[PDB]
Design a protein around this nucleic acid. Structure first.
Ligand SMILES: Nc1ncnc2c1ncn2[C@@H]1O[C@H](COP(=O)(O)OP(=O)(O)OP(=O)(O)O)[C@@H](O)[C@H]1O
Ligand SMILES: [Ca+2]
Ligand SMILES: [Ca+2]
Ligand SMILES: [Ca+2]
Ligand SMILES: [Ca+2]
Ligand SMILES: [Ca+2]
Length: 901
DNA sequence: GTGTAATCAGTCCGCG
DNA sequence: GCGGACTGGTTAC
């Protein structure tokens, strides 16, 4: 097989590499790698190396990496550019793996672990590690085993061995319900002292040294705790055995405010699952506890135990260990679904970077571009310092707030990457500038044509047309990958809808789900078999279809994010290819494209309707247009349609056969006007929206920019069994909005769009009467809590104290004296409730850690003093008033003459 | 740990 | 009470 790296490090003048050899074996080596860098040289000097602008370079080969680094500094002292890849491990990988890497995930040791630490005096700080580690569960992907290290004897209690038999039993048998599918995969090791536990853990680690190390909060808790605890008991040298090269760095993270300590383990790639989830999931959660995320992702119930975790080991060691094992498994289940580890390996190996560098699109693109250029013997420019400067972005149309009955939307496929490709925007393709007219003049095609030679953006930039830039070249490759995966995702989605339809008529039989590939549209034969299946089999198939869709989603959306990040990186001063001319070329072209096509669509529809000056485009954001279809429907007449699906077909056909060709003609003209390299503006229909046929539903409404709701029947070619709400920006979509309030507001919107004013009024009246019964967590607001200390003046709110910070200070006073009772953590999220006048907490609100029940000793008082009236007005009525006034609807029935009877 | 545009909640305080 | 200046936080692209 072809070799591939596992990890790479620079340690002094040595590259330390773990890799899989041609026989599939893991090996380690130390290489005295001699790096090359580059200097510009005279024209008269024969060379094969050129910088990206075509200027010749001489290669300088250094005796070692430190000599190369020292040369960089002296070049700075002289005032000359030192060219080439200054991150020598990336150069090493480029030399050692000079081919497209094919990796075998089954040979990569992926370790998933979690530790337990009993602490009678608050949260166990990893920097101090003053308490015994009393459990470790470590899952190894190569063995497919859960290794459980269990401390039976501690200063905080001596306990009995954990029983696998009890662990397997149902909760109703007194068991822990450890899933049957992992029972046979547990290797359980009890220890009568912590020293032997840790020594054996380290011997185990040596035997089965993780390549990828993951788990939940492992980077911020488990890794530093384990490292520091071993360090405290045995000394530094023993702790460094966590690194296969015995090198670690105690590395401090610097961001917005304050700092925290992480341990870099050389020769390991740590991908904390919480960080993977935050970067790759495109959710924003009210809480990031594993309980919370597991329930959301997998629909598993919260791990239930009595009393605080600080007393769980002594009171119920059996459950204590079972829950540690289950916690590790839940992360594996989340990954089975989301496939973020797979994604990281794919992207890491593609770029030829340390796998953990997938968190940095700048590092990722730096490596992609370096490897691409190196292939042609080209030499990358040196990174330079630049001042941070603001620059302009997208155009967003101001919508007239209103209901909108029938709506068809369209937007550009991969807008910014397509602009880069079309215009040929790249550091080395800059051809010069032209004299810019106001944007309006380009939009209306009255400005002088910018160039007859070069490809142009309305910001004044010109680009070469003879050859593709490296940025267009490399962005195209990842775009094509994105396109492939999105194809699979949409097929799985369409397949899902077929199953949902079939589920209206399940068969009374006993059978099996069909063995099919959900990434491809079901054949006619498959469709026929599905119509004969039982509900049980159909439901299993739907589950599998949806899992396939999720897998496609992960693969496609994060590839989209990477290519969009390249466009963004052009405007970040740390990017090697930072250039505000290029960043702005993209954004300004985008502004033109949207407004150009708005004009073209209006002109087209006025023509086919025989009107003049009528605005069919009601809204747009960045690269999208929303077109009112009322006049199109009315030209045929609502009475001519058999059912909702009939007019949906009609608009679908109209968009595909009339609008899109008109849109395409409009964009080809714009391409020619800007003299672009290649027409790549592809604005396909997104949504077909409207009320159910014959209903009093309003179909859709906008309250303002980035705030709207649509009742959608078909989304990018997916025809839904049931209409789906596309809601953007409204409170139903915000993690800050209470969960029950999101739900209630969404039902109000559903009723508005699908059923009408009377239905909305009926629901509002019920919610208002019943809502005080809702669980307090479900009606609590959510906020991130930064700078708690800044606003804390002797335990009370300082000037300009934010509402949620005020709540935290209230909480702090209320729990004063406890070494127990959860502390609010700087930077994490809190639930927030308003408090009625004259409450015993002495302020107007209280806040506590999100994803948790508020501590027992104040829970009762919070419940008693919760201000339901303020909560309702602020989170529910105020937003609903905004929705209904925009839609010209009343949420409460107004008086009428009929009341006289 | 790529980017800008945008609405909103809340504080403070003016507005005769 | 609403709005502007401001901070804080979050979402649409
Ligand atoms: N997370 C982001 N970072 C930087 N730029 C972004 C981001 N999201 C959107 N954009 C910019 O807005 C443009 C339009 O966004 P949109 O969500 O329509 O994605 P897209 O790239 O057009 O892909 P799609 O083909 O899914 O529409 C993007 O091309 C770019
Ligand atoms: Ca735990
Ligand atoms: Ca788009
Ligand atoms: Ca599309
Ligand atoms: Ca059937
Ligand atoms: Ca869009």
């Amino acid at each position: 097989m072809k070799e591939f790296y596992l990890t790479v490090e620079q340690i002094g003048d040595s590259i330390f590499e773990r890799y899989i050899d041609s026989n599939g074996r893991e090996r380690t080596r130390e290489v005295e790698y001699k790096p090359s860098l580059f200097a510009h040289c005279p024209e008269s000097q024969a060379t094969k190396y050129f910088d990206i602008y075509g200027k010749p370079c001489t290669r300088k080969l250094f005796a070692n990496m430190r000599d190369a680094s020292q040369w960089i500094k002296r070049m700075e002292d002289i005032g000359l550019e030192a060219l080439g890849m200054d991150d020598f491990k990336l150069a090493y990988l480029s030399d050692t793996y000079n081919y497209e890497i094919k990796y075998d995930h089954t040979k990569i040791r992926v370790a998933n672990f979690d530790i337990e630490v009993t602490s009678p005096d608050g949260f166990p700080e990893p920097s101090q590690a003053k308490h015994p580690i009393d459990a470790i569960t470590h899952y190894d992907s190569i063995d497919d085993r859960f290794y459980v290290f269990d401390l039976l004897n501690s200063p905080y209690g001596n306990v009995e061995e954990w029983s696998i038999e009890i662990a397997a039993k149902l909760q109703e048998q007194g068991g822990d319900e450890v899933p049957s599918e992992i029972i046979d995969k547990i290797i359980y090791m009890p220890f009568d002292n912590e020293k032997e536990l840790l020594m054996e853990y380290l011997n185990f680690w040596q035997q089965k040294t993780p390549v990828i190390l993951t788990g939940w909060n492992v980077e911020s808790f488990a890794i530093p705790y384990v490292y520091n605890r071993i360090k405290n008991i045995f000394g530094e040298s023993t702790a460094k055995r966590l690194s296969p090269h015995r090198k670690t760095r105690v590395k401090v993270i610097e961001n917005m405010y304050g700092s925290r300590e992480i341990i870099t383990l050389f020769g390991i790639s740590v991908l904390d699952y919480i960080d993977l989830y935050k970067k790759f999931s495109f959710t924003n959660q009210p809480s990031y506890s594993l309980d919370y995320i597991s329930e959301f992702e997998l629909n598993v119930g919260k791990l239930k135990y009595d009393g605080p975790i600080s007393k769980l080991r002594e009171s119920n060691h059996q459950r204590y260990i079972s829950y540690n094992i289950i916690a590790v498994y839940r992360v594996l289940q989340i990954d089975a679904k989301r496939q973020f580890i797979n994604l990281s390996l794919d992207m890491g190996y593609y770029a030829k970077i340390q796998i953990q560098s997938v968190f940095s699109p700048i590092k990722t693109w730096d490596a992609i571009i370096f490897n691409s250029l190196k292939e042609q013997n080209k030499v990358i420019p040196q990174g330079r310092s630049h001042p941070v400067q603001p620059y302009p972005g997208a155009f967003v149309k101001e919508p007239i707030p209103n209901r909108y009955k029938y709506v068809m939307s369209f937007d550009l496929t991969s807008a910014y990457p397509s602009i880069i490709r079309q215009v040929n925007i790249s550091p080395e393709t800059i051809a010069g500038t032209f004299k810019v007219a106001p944007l309006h003049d380009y939009i209306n095609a009255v400005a002088e044509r910018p160039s007859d030679v070069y490809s142009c953006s309305p910001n004044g930039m010109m680009y070469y047309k003879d050859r593709d830039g490296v940025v267009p070249t490399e962005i195209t490759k990842v775009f094509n990958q994105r396109k492939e995966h999105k194809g699979y995702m949409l097929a799985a989605q369409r397949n899902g809808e077929i199953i949902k339809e079939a589920l209206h008529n399940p068969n009374l039989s006993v059978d099996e789900p069909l063995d099919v590939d959900y990434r491809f549209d079901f054949s006619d034969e498959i469709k026929e078999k599905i119509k004969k299946l039982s509900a049980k089999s159909l439901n299993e198939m739907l589950f599998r279809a949806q899992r396939t869709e999720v897998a496609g989603m992960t693969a496609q959306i994060n590839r989209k994010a990477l290519i969009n990040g390249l466009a963004g990186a052009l405007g970040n001063v740390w990017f090697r290819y930072y250039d505000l001319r290029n960043a702005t070329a993209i954004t300004t072209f985008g502004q033109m494209a949207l407004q150009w096509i708005e004009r073209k669509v209006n002109e087209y529809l006025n023509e086919v309707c025989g009107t003049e000056g009528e605005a069919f485009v009601l809204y747009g954001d960045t690269d999208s247009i929303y077109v009112s279809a009322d006049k199109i429907i009315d030209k045929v007449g609502e009475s001519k349609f058999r059912d909702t699906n009939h007019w949906v077909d009609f608009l679908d056909k109209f968009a595909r056969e009339r609008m899109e060709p008109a849109i395409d003609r409009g964009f080809r003209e714009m391409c020619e006007y800007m003299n672009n390299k290649q027409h790549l503006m592809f604005m396909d229909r997104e949504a077909i929206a409207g009320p159910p046929l014959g209903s009093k539903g309003i179909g859709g409404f906008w309250t303002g920019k980035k705030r709207y709701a649509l009742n959608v029947w078909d989304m990018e070619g997916t025809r839904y069994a049931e209409p789906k709400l596309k809601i953007m920006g409204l409170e139903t979509q915000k993690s800050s909005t209470p969960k029950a309030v999101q739900k209630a507001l969404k039902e109000c919107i559903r009723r508005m769009l699908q059923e009408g004013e009377e239905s909305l009024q009926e629901y509002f009246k019920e919610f208002e009467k019943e809502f005080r019964q809702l669980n307090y967590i479900s009606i609590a607001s959510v906020s991130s809590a930064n700078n708690i200390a800044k606003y804390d003046v002797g335990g009370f709110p300082g000037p300009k104290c934010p509402f949620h910070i005020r709540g935290i200070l209230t909480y702090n006073r209320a729990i004063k004296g406890n070494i127990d009772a959860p502390q609010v953590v700087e930077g994490e999220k809190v639930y927030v409730l308003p408090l009625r006048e004259g409450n015993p907490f002495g302020d107007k609100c209280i806040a506590w850690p999100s994803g948790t029940e508020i501590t027992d000793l104040i829970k009762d008082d919070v419940l008693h003093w919760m201000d339901y009236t303020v909560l309702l007005e602020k989170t529910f009525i105020k937003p609903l008033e905004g929705f209904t006034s925009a839609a010209k609807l009343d949420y409460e029935k107004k008086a009428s003459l009929f009341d006289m009877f």
